[PDB]
Amino acid sequence: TCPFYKKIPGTGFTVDAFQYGVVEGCTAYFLTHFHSDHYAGLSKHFTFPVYCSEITGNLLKNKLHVQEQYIHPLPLDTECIVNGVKVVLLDANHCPGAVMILFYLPNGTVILHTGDFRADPSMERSLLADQKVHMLYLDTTYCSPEYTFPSQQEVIRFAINTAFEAVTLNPHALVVCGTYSIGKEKVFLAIADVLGSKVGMSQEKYKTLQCLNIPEINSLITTDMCSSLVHLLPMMQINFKGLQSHLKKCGGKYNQILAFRPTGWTHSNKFTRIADVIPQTKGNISIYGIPYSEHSSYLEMKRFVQWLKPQKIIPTVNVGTWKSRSTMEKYFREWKLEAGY
Ligand code: NI
């Protein structure tokens, strides 16, 4: 059944709750972003109102074929009324079109639902600064102190410098980047930019990227693989067997692959710096795992919460085990006692 952390009390609303059939008493289904664990269940047969960003609405229409009459896009940073209740959508710093949602309940309670987010100090100057938030539905994906990772900027600098060096040493090297969802587009776009190439990809992935309102996108991507020296492939294919295979397909245009796997966290983060990362190599193929995250580090999460000072926190990630739930509740209490709220 629909879990309680997907329901917004005092409303008929649910958030990211599309896989339970008809939720009894739901008058509006919000969708925070277009990732499969969140939209799971939506299709062309859905006949209830869906409230989302413009970009998520483009993806619902074009990729899932949800009918236009049930898609309700809202602008960001704008007070809107939905079934009698004031809401605001805020940028979540996750993947394209990802939002946080502020609900202003008729009784005076204010609720923030983060969806998936990567907390940033810039959020402390949004419409969130303007009133008190009583209840926080929090993306707790990396809520443990071992989870450190570098900034997105540091990671992109590493990838750009690595690729440019390799291709300038060997003009017959191919760059490949893995993907299995939207998000992390900066990785392959920044590398293609430094190399003066467009990124080549499948027709399905090109269609997905054409929904994202990225400026000048027609200048940056293509379905012509032969004219491109940065290829995107399914993340599943980013291994030695899959890459040797791909290289055979390029018809002796290339003699070397340099591949990037943008992982979330991996335990080499507890020891190794970004300057010190090394690839796995077999023959003329090298694979780099780079820690490009679109979720909060533990310290970024802690700073956000200690700034916001919520009265109650409801985790939305890692909720399935008693040990995880108890560990998270311990951190929340530490944070509250340290900051004095
Ligand atoms: Ni997500």
Side-chain angles (χ1 to χ4, degrees), residues 33 35 38 94 116 295:
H33 65 292
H35 280 165
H38 300 262
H94 183 55
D116 285 344
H295 296 272

Side-chain angles (χ1 to χ4, degrees), residues 93-203 205-215 217-240 242-247 249-261:
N93 192 35
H94 183 55
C95 63
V99 298
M100 317 191 284
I101 314 159
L102 261 182
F103 299 97
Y104 294 79
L105 271 44
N107 80 0
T109 298
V110 177
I111 297 180
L112 182 57
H113 195 306
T114 68
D116 285 344
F117 87 145
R118 182 164 186 178
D120 191 76
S122 66
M123 298 171 174
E124 302 160 18
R125 298 169 276 280
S126 66
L127 296 190
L128 288 177
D130 300 16
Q131 79 295 283
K132 190 191 174 48
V133 174
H134 306 87
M135 304 181 75
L136 177 59
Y137 287 63
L138 177 65
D139 170 17
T140 48
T141 296
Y142 296 125
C143 189
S144 199
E146 67 270 34
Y147 299 115
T148 56
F149 30 65
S151 70
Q152 293 175 165
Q153 190 268 333
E154 288 175 78
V155 177
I156 290 302
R157 174 93 298 198
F158 173 84
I160 285 170
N161 294 359
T162 300
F164 180 75
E165 176 185 308
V167 177
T168 298
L169 295 170
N170 181 189
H172 304 275
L174 172 59
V175 179
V176 180
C177 293
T179 185
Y180 44 31
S181 58
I182 62 166
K184 307 192 198 183
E185 290 82 9
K186 193 73 175 176
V187 180
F188 52 87
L189 303 175
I191 289 168
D193 180 76
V194 88
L195 301 179
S197 186
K198 299 195 183 185
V199 186
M201 61 197 75
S202 75
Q203 289 184 256
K205 186 67 178 180
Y206 182 93
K207 172 181 189 188
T208 298
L209 302 185
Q210 284 290 169
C211 297
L212 306 183
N213 293 353
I214 288 169
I217 193 59
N218 299 322
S219 74
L220 317 172
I221 60 175
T222 183
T223 56
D224 190 359
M225 309 295 282
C226 280
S227 63
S228 161
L229 60 141
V230 183
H231 302 170
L232 306 194
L233 297 179
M235 198 74 81
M236 284 195 70
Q237 207 172 344
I238 314 301
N239 49 73
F240 297 118
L243 289 163
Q244 286 166 198
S245 184
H246 184 66
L247 192 53
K249 275 163 258 180
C250 292
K253 203 164 197 304
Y254 308 107
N255 61 2
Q256 177 181 14
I257 282 172
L258 184 112
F260 295 89
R261 293 185 348 81

Side-chain angles (χ1 to χ4, degrees), residues 324-335:
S324 303
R325 286 194 158 286
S326 167
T327 302
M328 293 183 294
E329 295 176 4
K330 286 186 19 263
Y331 297 126
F332 304 148
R333 189 54 63 177
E334 293 181 6
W335 302 350

